[PDB]
Amino acid sequence: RNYSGGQQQAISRFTARPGDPQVEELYLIFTNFPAQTAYWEFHKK
Amino acid sequence: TQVLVMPKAVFESYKTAGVQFNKLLDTNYIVSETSVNDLAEIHQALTAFPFLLPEKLDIKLAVSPIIKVAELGEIDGPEQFKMKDLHNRLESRLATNELRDAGNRNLVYDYYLYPVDENLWVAVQQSAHIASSDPRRVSIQLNHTFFDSMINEMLNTRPRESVASTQIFTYYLESC
């Protein structure tokens, strides 16, 4: 039991911002699956 | 390549009958495998194709079979006079169609692209839609899946940066 002085954990500084469901779907493909990205099937989207 | 617009009825005949699509630009083959009416309808469908193709990328619209027949009828050879007789039949059948479908007037067609080699871009003229007010904009919105099909195929050989500067690429962006 420690009230006066105990552990002080770090507080996260960044808060995630909501994004557009379509930009996130395409972006995750852009970074995770860099194979179909250099084709019209992905570029058209 | 070279775009060859044909009605759905003609395209389905070619696919069902099993006509070599590769040799539809060779006058001597298409006239043997194509009826007089089909040849006239191909001419009419070419003359009703509203879009300007990317000439800067060497993509041309096919010369109609009637013109090719007319030219061969004036060139010495062993089939010249048979080709002249074919020309006369095409003109009478074409005039007969023009007098019947003149009422069509204010409509635009959906097109479907069926690529055949790198020298032939079969463009199937499908169902008509009625469009009187700004039919240019209506045609563009209707043919979304035609524009992206053309883009997908020319990006196989042409540089992406060059295709991006075409009117076909623009039409895609305007549609969506």
Question: Which of residues 137 through 156 in chain B touch A, CB cutoff 8 A?
Answer: 148, 151-152, 155
- Distance between CA atoms of residues B2 and B25, nearest Å: 9
Cβ <8 Å between B151 and A41: no
- Which helix (H) or strand (E) element contains residue B104? none
CB hemisphere CA count around B151 (13 angstroms): 27
Cβ <8 Å between A44 and B148: yes
State the alpha helices, DSSP H only, in B55-104.
Answer: 65-72, 80-100
- Distance between CA atoms of residues B150 and B112, nearest Å: 9
State the alpha helices, DSSP H only, in chain A.
Answer: 21-32, 40-43
B65 contacts B35 by C-beta, under 8 angstroms? no
For the purposes of burial, counting CB atoms within 10 Å of the CB of B173, is it exposed (0-12), middle (13-18) or buried (19 or more)? exposed
Kindly provide the resolution of this structure in angstroms, with one decimal: 3.5
- Distance between CA atoms of residues A27 and B129, nearest Å: 37
Cβ <8 Å between B148 and A41: no
